[PDB]
Amino acid sequence: MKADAVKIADGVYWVGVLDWDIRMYHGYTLNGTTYNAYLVFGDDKVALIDNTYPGTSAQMWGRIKDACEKEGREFKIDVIVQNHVEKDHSGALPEIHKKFPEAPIYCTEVAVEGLVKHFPSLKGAPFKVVKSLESIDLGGKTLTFLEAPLLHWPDSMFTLYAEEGILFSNDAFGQHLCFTQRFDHEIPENILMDANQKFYANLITPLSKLVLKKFKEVIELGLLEKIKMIAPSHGQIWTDPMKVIGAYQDFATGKCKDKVTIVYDTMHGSTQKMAHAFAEGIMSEGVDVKMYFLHNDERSEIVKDILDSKAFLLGAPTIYDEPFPSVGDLIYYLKGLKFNRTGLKRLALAFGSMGGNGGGTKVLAEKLKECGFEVLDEYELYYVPTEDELEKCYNMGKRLAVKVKEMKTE
Amino acid sequence: MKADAVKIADGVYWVGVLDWDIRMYHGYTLNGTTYNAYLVFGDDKVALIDNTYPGTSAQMWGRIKDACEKEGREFKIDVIVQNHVEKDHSGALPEIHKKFPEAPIYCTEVAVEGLVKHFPSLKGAPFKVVKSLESIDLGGKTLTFLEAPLLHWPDSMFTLYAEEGILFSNDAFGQHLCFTQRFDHEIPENILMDANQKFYANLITPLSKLVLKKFKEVIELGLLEKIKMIAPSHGQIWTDPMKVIGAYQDFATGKCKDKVTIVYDTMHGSTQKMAHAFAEGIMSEGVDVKMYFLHNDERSEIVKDILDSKAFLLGAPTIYDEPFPSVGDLIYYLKGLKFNRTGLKRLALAFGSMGGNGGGTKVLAEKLKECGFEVLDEYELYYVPTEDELEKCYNMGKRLAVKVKEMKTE
Numbered sequence: 102m103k104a105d106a107v108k109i110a111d112g113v114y115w116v117g118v119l120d121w122d123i124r125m126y127h128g129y130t131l132n133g134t135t136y137n138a139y140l141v142f143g144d145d146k147v148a149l150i151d152n153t154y155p156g157t158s159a160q161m162w163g164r165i166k167d168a169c170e171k172e173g174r175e176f177k178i179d180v181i182v183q184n185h186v187e188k189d190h191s192g193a194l195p196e197i198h199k200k201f202p203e204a205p206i207y208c209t210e211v212a213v214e215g216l217v218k219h220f221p222s223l224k225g226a227p228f229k230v231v232k233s234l235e236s237i238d239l240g241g242k243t244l245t246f247l248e249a250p251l252l253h254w255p256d257s258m259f260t261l262y263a264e265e266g267i268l269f270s271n272d273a274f275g276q277h278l279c280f281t282q283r284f285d286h287e288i289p290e291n292i293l294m295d296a297n298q299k300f301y302a303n304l305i306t307p308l309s310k311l312v313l314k315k316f317k318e319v320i321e322l323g324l325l326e327k328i329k330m331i332a333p334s335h336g337q338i339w340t341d342p343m344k345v346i347g348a349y350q351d352f353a354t355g356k357c358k359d360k361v362t363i364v365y366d367t368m369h370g371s372t373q374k375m376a377h378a379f380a381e382g383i384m385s386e387g388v389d390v391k392m393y394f395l396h397n398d399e400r401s402e403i404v405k406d407i408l409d410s411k412a413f414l415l416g417a418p419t420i421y422d423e424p425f426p427s428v429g430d431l432i433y434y435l436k437g438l439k440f441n442r443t444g445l446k447r448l449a450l451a452f453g454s455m456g457g458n459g460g461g462t463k464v465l466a467e468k469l470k471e472c473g474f475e476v477l478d479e480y481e482l483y484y485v486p487t488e489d490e491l492e493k494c495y496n497m498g499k500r501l502a503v504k505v506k507e508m509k510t511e
Numbered sequence: 512m513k514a515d516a517v518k519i520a521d522g523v524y525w526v527g528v529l530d531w532d533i534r535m536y537h538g539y540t541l542n543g544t545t546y547n548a549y550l551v552f553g554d555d556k557v558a559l560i561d562n563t564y565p566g567t568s569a570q571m572w573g574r575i576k577d578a579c580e581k582e583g584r585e586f587k588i589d590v591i592v593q594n595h596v597e598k599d600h601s602g603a604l605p606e607i608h609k610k611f612p613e614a615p616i617y618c619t620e621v622a623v624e625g626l627v628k629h630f631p632s633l634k635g636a637p638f639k640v641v642k643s644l645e646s647i648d649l650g651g652k653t654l655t656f657l658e659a660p661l662l663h664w665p666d667s668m669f670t671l672y673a674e675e676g677i678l679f680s681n682d683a684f685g686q687h688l689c690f691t692q693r694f695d696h697e698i699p700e701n702i703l704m705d706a707n708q709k710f711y712a713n714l715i716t717p718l719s720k721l722v723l724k725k726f727k728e729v730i731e732l733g734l735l736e737k738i739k740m741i742a743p744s745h746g747q748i749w750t751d752p753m754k755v756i757g758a759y760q761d762f763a764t765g766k767c768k769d770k771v772t773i774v775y776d777t778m779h780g781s782t783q784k785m786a787h788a789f790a791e792g793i794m795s796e797g798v799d800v801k802m803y804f805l806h807n808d809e810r811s812e813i814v815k816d817i818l819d820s821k822a823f824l825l826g827a828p829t830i831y832d833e834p835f836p837s838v839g840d841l842i843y844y845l846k847g848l849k850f851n852r853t854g855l856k857r858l859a860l861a862f863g864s865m866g867g868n869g870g871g872t873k874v875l876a877e878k879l880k881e882c883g884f885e886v887l888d889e890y891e892l893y894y895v896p897t898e899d900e901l902e903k904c905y906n907m908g909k910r911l912a913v914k915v916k917e918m919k920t921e
């Protein structure tokens with residue numbers, strides 16, 4: 102298919118793929134995304150940095166062809182860089198190798214085995230293992246590699262185009278957005294940063310300590326000031342790299358708002374009434390509230406709002422001695438994300454209605470603790486809340502909101 | 512339920528309902544909304560303006576009680592205003608009347624029949640039919656009524672509190688947003704105006720000519736300069752009324768961007784490949800694209816983007832001589848919304864794949880014309896597009912984008 106490349110610097114093009122139609126990936130929702138791949142034209146060698154998901158290469162090849170024509174060059178790739186083995190960025194590597202079998206493939210040591218396990222036709226491909234601070238010369242353009250294990254896979258690495266300071270960061274600093282506009286400043290800031298927050302919350306939270314360590318290494322290497330553009334593998338290219346670095350710094354150190362995220366499920370509406378009553382009390386103190394109903398809403402938006410919330414409420418009715426099962430999905434997600442690794446133990450309350458022996462709230466409190474929250478109280482009641490019982494929820498919310506505002510903003 | 516009112520002026524409170532959990536209403540999707548009701552404390556009479564959806568009054572009554580406490584007044588309503596009979600704003604009128612059976616109910620003539628048909632217990636209620644420019648005195652505060660038939664129901668009207676210039680406009684100027692923040696300036700502008708655009712597109716488009724007439728009447732009344740706050744029945748209160756009046760003016764006169772909305776469905780992916788190829792051609796001219804896949808996406812977001820798009824593409828495969836049935840839903844919606852009433856005949860193309868006698872694209876072209884679009888071309892092809900057939904889609908998109916940019920920005 103015919104598809105035009107987008108120039109991002111002299112001799113550097115975006116040749117990625119617009120996945121207009123995807124609505125879910127990993128455990129998170131979205132309204133399309135991109136698989137960003139880049140073509141760098143040196144005097145001697147043309148380098149392709151990352152590629153795209155299996156079966157979506159038609160756009161990529163069209164843009165690569167378009168870029169070579171604009172450069173007056175043959176349709177030829179001399180160098181292949183694979184920052185990350187996950188298949189939304191490597192899925193076309195077998196195609197690329199089959200068309201250019203002599204082009205070396207630069208990747209990390211553990212990436213070789215991962216790529217071969219994904220794509221057995223790559224066994225015997227000219228892999229060239231790289232380590233941090235190693236560089237290849239393309240002819241007037243230099244690519245420098247920086248290893249980034251567990252950011253977000255063991256195989257991950259960054260590639261820096263030194264002369265213009267363009268950091269190809271793969272997933273790091275990406276956002277799941279699919280626009281015709283390619284750069285951060287070309288879309289509304291609120292959309293950009295909300296998507297950055299969702300991306301961090303769902304993929305980077307458990308790596309928060311590795312983020313700070315990598316930031317400390319980049320600073321001591323003197324490399325931070327040499328980064329003028331961050332070109333991630335999903336979403337917008339950052340012409341303001343410090344904006345997203347500052348965001349990651351905030352998220353990794355627990356900088357939160359006077360904000361509470363309330364999550365609940367219900368069968369007959371009683372736990373829902375309690376959840377709304379807790380919100381009224383919280384709002385009476387000027388503290389913000391996000392309200393999620395697990396019947397309708399899903400984990401990826403919930404954890405987005407938890408990321409900059411100082412407190413997290415979870416409620417569910419008791420059903421055969423256990424909390425309603427929908428909470429198990431979120432709890433298992435929170436056990437993997439480990440929000441306590443941001444440096445903050447967010448406050449929490451457990452609540453629900455019951456009709457017999459109860460116990461669901463007890464379980465929720467235990468799980469909220471296993472997930473790294475500081476549970477301050479529990480409240481379980483019988484069937485439909487009375488007027489006074491909703492006032493108790495209001496009072497509990499108010500007291501929580503007071504504590505939220507006294508917690509110092511990290 | 513305990514719930515705090517929000518003061519919006521001296522002696523004026525928001526006593527509405529936060530519908531945190533609703534995700535669909537009318538024919539549109541949402542992430543919660545509010546049912547805004549307002550309490551006006553005159554020296555002599557307390558007036559409640561609109562109310563809420565049936566079964567959701569607990570918050571409203573809590574805020575009414577709170578407002579009376581803050582004013583040092585009796586828990587008492589002296590006057591009831593019903594701007595609009597639709598039940599998300601009248602659902603609690605039977606409750607309010609049963610509690611304060613002597614409080615007159617001010618509404619339009621045709622509203623009386625509608626409210627009694629909705630709520631038979633209101634037969635015999637102290638209705639007081641009002642007409643435009645009639646006023647009532649609350650004791651230092653005046654409410655002036657302005658009829659607004661078919662904005663958006665025949666029964667609709669606005670209520671103006673003259674001394675502070677607060678226009679209670681019911682659905683007009685509303686947006687489906689559910690935040691703890693009550694005012695326009697307290698949330699990101701992009702969210703506010705995108706929600707305003709969706710509300711207009713889905714509810715106001717066929718009334719575009721009545722909007723301009725009502726604007727012309729308000730101006731000739733010398734009344735536009737007397738409006739300092741627009742307090743709608745959904746979403747945020749406008750402290751900058753001219754911002755939303757300007758937006759309505761643009762939408763009602765066809766002011767669009769260099770933007771194309773593309774909608775398609777597919778069974779085997781061929782129509783999808785065509786849609787993506789049309790987008791590449793459009794983007795090669797710098798024209799924006801929104802891409803919607805009817806399997807995953809729904810009508811209310813589609814028509815939001817059509818509202819400020821200069822062109823609309825629609826594609827579907829042929830199935831037993833007809834286009835894939837999902838297009839029938841959108842077409843029936845566009846038949847009701849009548850985008851040509853904005854003063855603009857948006858450009859359009861019909862396309863799709865076929866496997867036999869075809870004819871689907873023929874049908875799409877006819878329906879796009881019945882819906883008020885200017886169909887420029889059709890393109891139907893056999894099974895999977897070839898390389899050259901995708902280039903034709905690209906070329907057609909490119910030529911369309913040229914015409915789009917030549918269309919004068921109304």
Ligand SMILES: Cc1cc2nc3c(=O)[nH]c(=O)nc-3n(C[C@H](O)[C@H](O)[C@H](O)COP(=O)(O)O)c2cc1C
Pocket residue numbers: 127304
């Ligand atoms: C977001 C994400 C996080 C992951 N975390 C881990 C991990 O912590 N440990 C691990 O061994 N594999 C991890 N993986 C790798 C998956 O287990 C691996 O890709 C697996 O083959 C996926 O299996 P599937 O095809 O059934 O989805 C992660 C993958 C993703 C996408």
Ligand SMILES: Cc1cc2nc3c(=O)[nH]c(=O)nc-3n(C[C@H](O)[C@H](O)[C@H](O)COP(=O)(O)O)c2cc1C
Pocket residue numbers: 537714
């Ligand atoms: C957005 C909207 C637009 C409407 N437009 C019309 C209309 O054009 N003509 C009409 O007679 N009724 C119109 N109605 C009224 C509905 O037909 C009426 O409320 C009906 O009783 C709804 O039936 P239902 O309860 O089965 O939804 C409209 C209602 C809504 C919410």
Ligand SMILES: [Fe+3]
Pocket residue numbers: 185187253272
């Ligand atoms: Fe990844």
Ligand SMILES: [Fe+3]
Pocket residue numbers: 187189190272334335
């Ligand atoms: Fe990725």
Ligand SMILES: [Fe+3]
Pocket residue numbers: 595597663682
């Ligand atoms: Fe309405």
Ligand SMILES: [Fe+3]
Pocket residue numbers: 597599600682744745
């Ligand atoms: Fe309404």
